[PDB]
Amino acid sequence: MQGSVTEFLKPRLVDIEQVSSTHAKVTLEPLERGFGHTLGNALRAILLSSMPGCAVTEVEIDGVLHEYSTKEGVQEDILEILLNLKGLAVRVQGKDEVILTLNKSGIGPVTAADITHDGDVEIVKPQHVICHLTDENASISMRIKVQRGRGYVPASTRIHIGRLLVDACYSPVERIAYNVEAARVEQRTDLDKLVIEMETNGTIDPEEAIRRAATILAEQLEAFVDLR
Amino acid sequence: MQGSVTEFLKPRLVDIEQVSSTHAKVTLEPLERGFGHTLGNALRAILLSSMPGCAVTEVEIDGVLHEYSTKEGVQEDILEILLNLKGLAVRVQGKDEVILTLNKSGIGPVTAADITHDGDVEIVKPQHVICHLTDENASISMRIKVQRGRGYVPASTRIHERPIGRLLVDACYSPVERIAYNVEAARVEQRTDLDKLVIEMETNGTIDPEEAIRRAATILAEQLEAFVDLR
Amino acid sequence: MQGSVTEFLKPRLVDIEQVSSTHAKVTLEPLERGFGHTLGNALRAILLSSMPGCAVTEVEIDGVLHEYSTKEGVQEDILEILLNLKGLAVRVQGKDEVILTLNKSGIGPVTAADITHDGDVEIVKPQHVICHLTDENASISMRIKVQRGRGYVPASTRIHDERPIGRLLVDACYSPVERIAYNVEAARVEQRTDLDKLVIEMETNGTIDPEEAIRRAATILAEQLEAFVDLR
Amino acid sequence: QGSVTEFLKPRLVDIEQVSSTHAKVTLEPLERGFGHTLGNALRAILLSSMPGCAVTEVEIDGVLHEYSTKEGVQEDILEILLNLKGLAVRVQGKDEVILTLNKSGIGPVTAADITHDGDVEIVKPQHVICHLTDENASISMRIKVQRGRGYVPASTRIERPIGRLLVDACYSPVERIAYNVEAARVEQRTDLDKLVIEMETNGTIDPEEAIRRAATILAEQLEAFV
């Protein structure tokens, strides 16, 4: 090449290792010394708190008046059910609120697969157990409210009829970790590669989780443009 | 939620408090919770290591063959002069290298103000003493090389050249010297959650506080180009 | 149900076991005897041939004229590159044709991660090697055409034209389903004893999710039957 | 997937009744490979999931056990139950209908002698159930016809005894199925087939409705994936 004063060498998503359906290892590579931790800490903060996502916020179970109520033909208590509903990982098309209906009579587990198939709704882990009906004459009929939000708004902060409130885990990102490691490139010798380890709820893809973290970051800096 | 700026309020340079000529307190305000430290740490890392800046790298003094003493008519030894030249804070237009000539005969201090006025070269502290000529028949004539760079770069360079440069001085190209930040709850009255990031800067004068920030942000934003939109 | 016309248990996606990023095991459960193989064979046929998906159809490499010509500074021959481009797994937003540009100068592998970042495009396996530049003065600049199609249409089945000169044709593997297998297994239900559970083993190219691959197979099936299920 | 109409959907294009209980239905616009896909799907539904009414119980006056024979009837009670098994009846919208058969005279007591019920349609009225020998002979029975699936034997059911008799239920409205894919010569394109489904029914079901019910069972199984 030809120049006089170098000041670039930007990283790019170079590899994706899906350890599982909800755990991956993304690696941004050309990283000038010190930039591993700079982007690593910036992103880890965005991923761990500013990611969008859908989450169950309310549930209306038939016969259940309040949380400390009773469901004779159900193994776990209503509280345990709301705790089960919190882990309902759902990916919805574009709406910011969708009502899910769950009708189930029988002996055995009432899983997320028993939820009424809505075309515009995606159930990440259908094998996710929400209930366990004990007797063969037992049944549950509930309307699970799923909303689009950010972060973690628990039941407390509110201003509210069997409307059962459930702690909202809106964030598609469950656990972020990063390592800087020497990306021993043939060319130079001082370059690193940032390895971002993700543990999502499935509702978000690793690469899109990164491209949204970067977008939140870059947009915060919009008022400090200065080209070059 | 749609395109270009969502729910997230964005920060902007809201105030600049120059504690002195080289120490200031910049404050970016509308900051959603958690963004104070996110930008604060991102920027503090860019400011503390990726800032450009000019620095004296070589000096050619007439009569002086090498860094070890003997200069007839000058108070301080050549080494002390090179150490003095290191502190020469210069802000240049757009040359990654400019040669400054300093001719001076006369009793008293040879300051940075005596350097030959180059149009594009801006001398931050003209009262910066480089020398002290003892007798009245004493004089120095040197060509000070000023280069653009980043970070510290020791006198270690080369191994074995029409144009030369006899004496070498350790280059501390960084303009930014020390960074500190505080998040503090902002004051807007309406939403009273919001924070304001206060970035405390101690520069070498060759760089303005706001431009130091807008360059830090630009290095950050450009690193993210493969995950955002630009490029 | 009340007057009764049904008298039959309907299966539903009950579990998804992602053996890996591109291999999963989907299981539809309440299945009346004989229905495991009936749906299993129906679906396996739809999945194995009627699935949509994105695929590289054309490529325009700078300096390369014919598909059987040389290249300065690249390890593998142009044919090998087109074969490499076939395995480019890309997931695009909403578009039946997107042009991807790949500019790369240097030494080492030119992977899918080097493709110019389009917002519209999603590159499934960025570590996918497309090239290997031998000398440092070596470089490739190509425009890879990615189209939305169905199943697999070989180069042969594109023998006419448009701009034959330069545009190198590549075999299109539109379907994101590389291999399907199914097992019926007794779903040893709590009370019943005639019920099975259909286990569909999938080996996709990543561009398609297991459950959506099934819900698209079922949709192709159900829609074929539209003239015998309603139409009135 | 963007989805929405790209494949050539087939439709019932012709019906060739080789006889009263044997037909050849043909669904035509069929993209390559879809002949066998639908052909095998349907053939499995037709061969095992079809409804159909069947005689399950019979209450003959004077008769108690199957070991009885009757005063005035040619064939023994067992033979009569075996005759009742072949009673092909098509009922409106019910899962159980009681048929009454009163008959005095000499000659065959056929399905045509069964008391005309509005809902009940008797497919083969000339179907012989009995043969009364003397002219003072007569039978009076209530034949129970139920809706169900597949072949459900009498052993799946069995003061002391109730009224009487049980008969092996052959609910399946269809006996045998066969299909051929054959290239269609549709005057549009050329890489298309036509599925020919050969049916041998018991008469209680029409060919086209047998297909439209097979397709409906199929499509409804896929409801959770559509």
Walk me through this protein's architecture.
Chain B: GO terms for molecular function: DNA binding; DNA-directed RNA polymerase activity; protein dimerization activity. Chain B: It comes from Escherichia coli (strain K12). Chain B: Its EC number is 2.7.7.6. Chain B: It catalyses: RNA(n) + a ribonucleoside 5'-triphosphate = RNA(n+1) + diphosphate. Chain B: This is DNA-directed RNA polymerase subunit alpha. Four copies of one chain form a homotetramer. Chain A is α+β, with helices and mostly antiparallel strands and 228 residues long. The first copy, chain A, has two domains: 2-52 and 171-224, Gyrase A, domain 2; 53-170, RNA Polymerase Alpha Subunit, Chain A, domain 2, CATH 2.170.120.12. In chain A, 16% of the residues lie in helices and 33% in strands. The first copy, chain A, has three helices and twelve strands. Chain A has helices at 35-47, 78-86, 206-220; strands spanning 13-18, 23-31, 54-61, 90-92, 97-105, 108-111, 121-123, 129-133, 139-148, 164-165, 173-179, 192-200. A four-stranded antiparallel beta sheet of chain A has the order 1-2-12-11, covered by helices on one side. In chain A, strand 1 (13-18) and strand 2 form a beta hairpin. In chain A, helix 1 crosses helix 3 (206-220). The longest helix of chain A has 15 residues, at 206-220. Chain A is elongated. Chain A starts with 12 loop residues before the first strand and ends in an 8-residue tail after the last helix. The interface between C and D is large, with 45 and 42 residues.
